[PDB]
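Reader question, answered in our methods column.
A reader sent in the components of a multi-part assembly and asked whether the whole thing could be modeled at once rather than chain by chain. We filled in our standard form and ran it. Here is what they sent:
COMPLEX SIZE: two components
ENTRIES:
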Amino acid sequence: ATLEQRPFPYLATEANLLTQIKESAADGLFKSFQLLLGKDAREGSVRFEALLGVYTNVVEFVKFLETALAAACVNTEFKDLRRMIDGKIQFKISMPTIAHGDGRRPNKQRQYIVMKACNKHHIGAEIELAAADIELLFAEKETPLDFTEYAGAIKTITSALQFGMDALERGLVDTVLAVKLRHAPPVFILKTLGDPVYSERGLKKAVKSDMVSMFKAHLIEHSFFLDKAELMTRGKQYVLTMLSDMLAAVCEDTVFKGVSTYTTASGQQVAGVLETTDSVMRRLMNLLGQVESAMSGPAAYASYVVRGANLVTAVSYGRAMRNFEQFMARIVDHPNALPSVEGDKAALADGHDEIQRTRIAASLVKIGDKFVAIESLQRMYNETQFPCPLNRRIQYTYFFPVGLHLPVPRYSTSVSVRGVESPAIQSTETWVVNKNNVPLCFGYQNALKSICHPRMHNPTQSAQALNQAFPDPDGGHGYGLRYEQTPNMNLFRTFHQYYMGKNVAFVPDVAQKALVTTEDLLHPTSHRLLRLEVHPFFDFFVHPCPGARGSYRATHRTMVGNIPQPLAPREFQESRGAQFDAVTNMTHVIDQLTIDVIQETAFDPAYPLFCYVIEAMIHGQEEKFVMNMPLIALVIQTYWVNSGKLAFVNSYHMVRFICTHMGNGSIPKEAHGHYRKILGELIALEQALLKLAGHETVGRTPITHLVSALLDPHLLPPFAYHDVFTDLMQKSSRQPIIKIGDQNYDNPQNRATFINLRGRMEDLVNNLVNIYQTRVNEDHDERHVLDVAPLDENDYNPVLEKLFYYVLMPVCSNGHMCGMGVDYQNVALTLTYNGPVFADVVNAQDDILLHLENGTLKDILQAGDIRPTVDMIRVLCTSFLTCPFVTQAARVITKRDPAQSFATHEYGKDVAQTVLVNGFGAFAVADRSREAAETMFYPVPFNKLYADPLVAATLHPLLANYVTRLPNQRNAVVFNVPSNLMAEYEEWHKSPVAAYAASCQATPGAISAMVSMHQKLSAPSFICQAKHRMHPGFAMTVVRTDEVLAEHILYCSRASTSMFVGLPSVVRREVRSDAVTFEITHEIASLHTALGYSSVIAPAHVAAITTDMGVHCQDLFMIFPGDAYQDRQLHDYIKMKAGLPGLSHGQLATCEIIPTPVTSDVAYFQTPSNPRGRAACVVSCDAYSNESAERLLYDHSIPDPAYECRSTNNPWASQRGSLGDVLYNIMYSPCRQFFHKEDIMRYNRGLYTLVNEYSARLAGAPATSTTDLQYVVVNGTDVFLDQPCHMLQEAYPTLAASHRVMLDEYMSNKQTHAPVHMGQYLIEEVAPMKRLLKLGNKVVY
Amino acid sequence: MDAHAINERYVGPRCHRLAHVVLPRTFLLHHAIPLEPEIIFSTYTRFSRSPGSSRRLVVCGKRVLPSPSGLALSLPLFSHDGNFHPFDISVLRISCPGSNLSLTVRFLYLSLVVAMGAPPVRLSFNPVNADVPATWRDATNVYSGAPYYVCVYEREDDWLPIPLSFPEEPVPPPPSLVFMDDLFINTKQCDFVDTLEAACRTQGYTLRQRVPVAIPRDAEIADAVKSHFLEACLVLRGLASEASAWIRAATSPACWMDVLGLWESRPHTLGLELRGVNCGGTDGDWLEILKQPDVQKTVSGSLVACVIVTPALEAWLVLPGGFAIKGRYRASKEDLVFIRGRYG
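And here is the structure of the entire assembly that came back:
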């Protein structure tokens, strides 16, 4: 790999075949003489043989005066330039005015004084003379071998001396062409600046915007003009008006306009030099035939030397002057001579009229009116294998989206495509055509080397850039922040302390985002909602610490469904849940007819209260239900016959026991079928959830515990009746804390002091008086001990409870569910203290209400319309014995998943949940029997899916007063929950989950919407969605860069630069025993004599595309190596599932992922602006005002300058502190073009300083050339990059297509393809280069 | 678990016994100890019935990754004159070098001493090792009520128990000798507020402005500023804290400020130093106080009061609106020895 990269690759592989061809050391050499020992001298003595060789000369090149480039520069030979320090030119521009008769102020006289300088240049070449070659140059020769040894050394010295003089005449033409190219700004800038019809008002703020909007429009429409005219009909007429556009944009305002340096042979003057490569020149000779092929210029340099009067002031004063004799003959000889033009033209022509004329061979051409010479200097850069400077490498940026969601009134235009018109299908990839027309896909699994990285998953880097943006935040209401624990178990006390005299109701930052639509959040009248949209995965708020001023903290969202409705809308969660259905191939057991039964019970105004009394007496027990199965078969039957609805739908354990334990004809056969279909659904859901979770394990912990939240056992079901709290602790690496009031609960070894169990009733017939002694004596407001039944691990499974309360009940009831709390000893006081229960004289198999009195049971049994027997209520009386105490709440604080243990504060690593012990959730209580419910039950709002005001106002008339005093809180999303029961930021379910369930349609597709909504939003869940080609809850944008080998055309007008050529000076610097080296220096100065720009460059023809336009994501594990997760078994798992000898298409393009809301517009991705979401043009605003140019980039009080309607496309990347600002504002990052604040503020100055800096200085960190992985460049020696996107802050769109077929329709008809189909789109590319696109045989230009 | 055996070699000879202590996450969650590796611990014990101060020793602490799990430490126990005292607080002070963090964790010896109850010359090479097995014995903290574990490592040893010297009569009750700090600081706060109320009586039950802040003209606002003063007297009296501003001013070798949280809307941040501000009491010195970002919000805003303590133990209670009352902490010469010993 060293044979090819070394220059002259054909002579290298040929000269390195000598090792195979050589057999004796006199192989290629000829024989000349013989050295005998005498005259014959023996046949056996040693004879010597003089060997001669063949040398080829150095190919000489045309000197500088005989090239046609010297029509652009004025040549003088300044003999001693190594003595010069500086040189200056001083202009004095007097300006006339117009005298007019309006009222405005007449102008006085004005002058300008302009001071130009001299740039100095230094050239060095080395010459090696061998010490064996110098030694015989001074020796005495007297034999015919020493004459042919001497003559072979005088030729070696001169051929090394012709080489050094060759490498300086190459050095002139390189350093003149390097001066011409640093002051050569391109056409698209200078065509508008060169016309004074735009800047006649002065460059205001609105003229610069109209002028930058023509920098873009000429860069796209008129670029690579000799390649755009291969496929036009006009052809010659288009190139000629393009190349007489370059000809006139140059200002011909030179001091040497009157000085006639070069002429034509006919008498006209050569106006300029038009320099191309070889490949462009042979096409400008066919479009434009040469007219003369002859010119006549000077033959020698003008000679300037410091003679007798300058030499005194050069020695003594240290300042000299050009042509002292003219300065002295005007100051003292004619002091009153006014500056006239013709009397001065001899003096301004600094000897350039005295030089002898000659005959110069150069290919002229006529362009409209002017005679213009055309060169090609490629034949001097090919002979020495250096890169020609006119093969600049233009580097463009490109961007395309992937995975978006199109809004609800879906349309189409096309008539061809058929297969992909479904509303349930969603693309998860976009197709990009490669350089060699290989249409490649960019999926999420290709996108995973940079997502699953802990720079994407921590707020500690993002809450510090947000704290330097708004350093003094007002911590206002601290509402949903933290759980203030107090020692109570009376949940009627903490309920009644909070809603007593509440007159003001606060809404958090989160509960007012899930009601805003996708378009209201981006409109610039809302700073405050849009300001804390910083990160996709996290959720920010204001914490009151430190001191009196706030600070920003963050909680993780933990799910896909905690993304708000502006960023994951309602019809997207449905079409993401229908993709959950298609991969697992699950079949819904529940039909729409059974949801129609469950929903009618939830909105029942006459639901019986008596089935709450049964469910409170069972409280989820195996034994206690079998005792009462001849009673609940009457409550269900007298509610299915009297009305089409079915009872006992509240909790899971009543639905489970009805399906399993009957198996008979007690319930009617139609009514029992609806119960079987519920448990048929829940089992089929967890069959599907165990397919996508996979079989494999990270470490001790499986991945089924870590992909979804419906399978993670740390999420407890909201109503626990058993000892679920100790079964969690013995099988958990995430260390839990149960807070039973004040005292924490840590270890399973301390179970007896905190948790008191109560087993079977048949086993507890002995210790049963000891239960009632604790009902009277103990203080239950400060008991701190919860009573639950012992649980058997072969009986239950927590996932079916979790699929019931969190998926099926918020859908089918549409979120009308509150946590009903029970006072148990007041329930059975109605039942046992009856009188037909107590008196044993009454018949057991007799009707109840024939014998019962005016109490509450006459009014409760009038609700359910039940005629039970006396045996039935007497069995319900027996359930009072092992009946638990008041319903309690235990807050289960567990640590977060190892993919989620990055937090701003110390409490942010712990997620929490309050589980209502011995209580049950219940629907809207019937208004005919609220008096009976007011004597038995009370509401406990404790969760987002279980805090509903229209249900909770029924249970207690104080909350019915609270809802009717201020009707803001009548929604479930808005409603205030006490701070002793719930804090929303420290919670799994975090209000945008509770806002989806209130706006469902209760569709069978909405059941599977919720199951694909409890999908963990972490790094090792994104692997499990990328294998099955699912859609995680965010789309993303890609950014690339691509190089182009553009062959250019340089024009440079007549006599603009003036050169000062010194003398070559030899300096010996090394003497060895083997050879002597030298170094020839040669110093050149050069000054620009014109005022405006005098040379203009243009891209003409693309030679090749270097970088292939293929998908290759930038892995963040190489760029940030020190980052790691807390685990090592999980950092080695992600690094394994995410991630060259030789490449096939070309240099690989790095792709960078900017995550984006799924509701972002496709019509942003068609027009070429940057992927920030806001425009970053700083040339528009005022000069040197750094405080004003920052309001463009980051302030959202204003709309962005692109769109007057919205403010920002993606708030996840535009703002201060956002994930785009965190990663890419501080290998090669194409997003550093767009996000880096310091580089953008370089273009705040005046737009003529930018043009001077454009061609001269290379920009901030571009990419390397011909390296496999596209590194960042340094030292810039032979580096010819031209990036016009760093000035305009825009990226050009490519071919993207959401499906394969949309790109097969673009090929077949370029005009009438639909850009937006129903779910799918196509971005037709708007790039400054056009290409041929061949997919098969069909061509789209 | 390496953090125990490192301290037996370097903290060991500077002590009498080491209390090897492992703090679980349940103890860490209450005191909010964010386990970064930059934290530099420091330990000193506050004596009783003797001149109370010992030397500060820097103790290594390492997180244990998993049979318990949590932060591992080693507390020094000091036997002055051959025996331990039962009521003797061993104070742990937790702080970061760069950022702003200061925590005080305190342990009592009866929760520690009880938990301890069941030819070329060769050179000696004694590396640090975790070869010695641990015995894990339960303990509960007296001050918070959070459990922590105590290691007893294997080594006139088995013959004797670990010595104690119980206090003698006459004695204060042991609930009042345990909280010796929280009953001395509380009575300096309850006597500070009695100076703030005494300045109202000598003025005529008025509050005068000190800071030039325009107040909007509404009668309900003028009655609300009075409610910030009476709420500040409920908070200053209930506050019995180790890290108050006047303790920082008494042990100073600079104005020491501590803002409050009225009506429990904020937790307290105490002991903030006002660097570059000399509280002389002249009108040109209140501009330097208003250049602090806290006092711009304790005055323009609401629900926050603010106390600024001079080095001369005179303190103003700054109310929203610019109203202030000069008050005085009275600390005698006997109590400055009591404070600069145990705290400074």
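What stands out: Chain B is about 25% helix and 20% strand. The first strand of chain B starts at residue 17 and ends at 24.
Send us your own complexes using the same form.
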